[PDB]
From Swiss-Prot, chains A, D:
It catalyses: (2S)-2-hydroxy-3-oxobutyl phosphate + 5-amino-6-(D-ribitylamino)uracil = 6,7-dimethyl-8-(1-D-ribityl)lumazine + phosphate + 2 H2O + H(+). This is 6,7-dimethyl-8-ribityllumazine synthase. Homopentamer. The active site is at 86 (proton donor). Belongs to the DMRL synthase family. It is an enzyme of class 2 (transferase). Competitively inhibited by riboflavin (Ki of 17 uM). Pathway: Cofactor biosynthesis; riboflavin biosynthesis; riboflavin from 2-hydroxy-3-oxobutyl phosphate and 5-amino-6-(D-ribitylamino)uracil: step 1/2. (2S)-2-hydroxy-3-oxobutyl phosphate binds at residues 83-84, 125. One of its GO terms (biological process) is riboflavin biosynthetic process. Its EC number is 2.5.1.78.
Swiss-Prot record, chain C:
The lineage of its organism: Eukaryota, Fungi, Dikarya, Ascomycota, Taphrinomycotina. InterPro entries: LS, LS/RS, LS/RS_sf. Homopentamer. The gene is rib4. One of its GO terms (cellular component) is cytoplasm. It comes from Schizosaccharomyces pombe (strain 972 / ATCC 24843) (Fission yeast). It catalyses: (2S)-2-hydroxy-3-oxobutyl phosphate + 5-amino-6-(D-ribitylamino)uracil = 6,7-dimethyl-8-(1-D-ribityl)lumazine + phosphate + 2 H2O + H(+). Its EC number is 2.5.1.78. This is 6,7-dimethyl-8-ribityllumazine synthase.
Length: 150, 151, 148, 150, 147
């Protein structure tokens, strides 16, 4: 178990979907602020890209890490169960896709996908309403894996 | 600003299944119209191919992107839960197959697969009966991913 | 419907579990291809494997030996008392998709994943049902053709 | 469809887990006896190996078919639903793993995995208490796939 | 009576739910040393933040060093969302894939439980059996059969 991980030279990629921006924004912010403030990652070394939806996360990431070199990637998206089976099938495919991209590439990919039953749960996990911002955890994870990959 | 994304040079492939044409037609139309009118995609640059069912979607796409060059693909199909477990297993394999074809090829594949409980849900998601045509969203996603693929 | 594939070579691999349902499905696929799409009887290879589990491998092995424009994998899985049905249904469906994608040869899913035998027979065209094998035959012809 | 399949020259590999040996033993026995007595496979041409649990089946098989040449493989294991979600996740992963090893290697891999709700169901499928020994079916399947792979 | 004095074993564990993780890792190690004669110097232990990182942590490590076997240990507890279901499935598949891709035996040491009690129980507490011991023996056995 580590303690004070600093990655001043780590290059971090954050790709986030744009559905449910109320939850996405705090998550990205929390990941960024945690990496900068707690791990000395440099703001200019954090590329933040977006894709329309969670479905595009794996491909978005795959495309970006083929272009630039990153020490770790955080894919962030929020899927909320709806009236059809859409949520179940794409949640599964996206999580599998994210794992696959990480394993195929050798680049640590941190899962920042919330797969919740309703918006309240998503907001709660983004740090609102007394909840804990999971983005912070993902930021620290990215830093740790990025460092271990070096 | 998704609306300000223009892809006059994008070559987009739309492969759609032919099951549940009442829902498929508006979805395909929505995607095409959105790409053309909202993203300046050229009608000549949009190839539309069909396959019998959703099952054939990954293979139809895989075959087509091996033949021509596309900046993005939209796989469209409507799967409605039936009396057997057919729906559950093929929905899962098709979604995985679409994701796989995209990742294997590097070509953005937009999921335009409706996995619904009944036809009303499908029609509703095709923009009928007060619903929003999801095909429009897929058209915009394809343009955005196509552009981000080149640049 | 006006799709003709007089030069298509089609492979049908079917499992042998639940032959009462398998036979009509295979027959419907073959008849539909011959009668409706002008596929030649001698250009249709039919092979069988013991169960649905072997469908992906039986197909992979066959398309590695001969050249086919399309393949129909036919099997009938009926939900039983254990979780066997769920796990192999998913693995076989995945396997069939994989073999198609890996090989580039269209693989038509002719796998029924039903709750009971009545549903399987119904989908094989018995008891007022529609023979799904016919649809698969047409799908195979269409995909074989589109694979140019 | 086939009549009387004989594989006197077939080399068959059986890899079996060791969890729930009461059920495993009859399965292996049924497969072996069926291949020998009904398909003329030679006892000395049947290699039997074991791994600790079902999780290790794909890897155990992969390792063995890399070392020796087999016409077919039967992977045998018994997973019984427990109190956690372990059963669901490993059943899926092992079944997928077995299909993968077979497709990857081109060597027929017969699924000899029981995924049951309780031990009674497992013994029943191992031919006890009036049940049919599924191992017999697997032995015949292996011979048939082994022969067709020629 | 399986002894692997020359086996090099890697244990990668997540750090979520350390109350359960610690006994698991300890059990796997003690078992390998005491029961299989694996040498303390030949056991590498690395950690990753969460179960999600297990496959990648393992893949990266077996690319760097040579191990005869690997145990990926993590504890996932069902929560209020569907997170548990989706990641358990992806991590288990991830672990199976890393082992098959690399040819290095990967022993699954992931607990996928409904609550903490079940995890602690499978870590040898409150009268339970420490599953880490079993993983330690499986790793040894697979490490050896890989030779």
């Amino acid at each position: 178990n580590p303690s004070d991980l600093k990655g001043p030279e780590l290059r971090i990629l954050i790709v986030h979907a744009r559905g449910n921006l109320q939850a996405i924004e705090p998550l990205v912010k929390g990941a960024v602020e945690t990496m900068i403030e707690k791990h000395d990652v440099k703001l200019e070394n954090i590329d933040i890209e977006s894709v329309p939806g969670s479905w595009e996360l794996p491909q978005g990431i795959r495309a970006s890490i083929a272009r630039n070199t990153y020490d770790a990637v955080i894919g962030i998206g929020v899927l909320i169960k709806g009236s059809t089976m859409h949520f179940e099938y794409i949640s599964e495919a996206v999580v599998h896709g994210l794992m696959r991209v990480g394993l195929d590439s050798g680049v640590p990919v941190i899962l920042g996908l919330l797969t919740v039953l309703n918006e309240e749960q998503a907001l709660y996990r983004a740090g609102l309403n007394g909840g804990h911002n999971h983005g912070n955890d993902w930021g620290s994870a990215a830093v740790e894996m990025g460092l271990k990959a070096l």
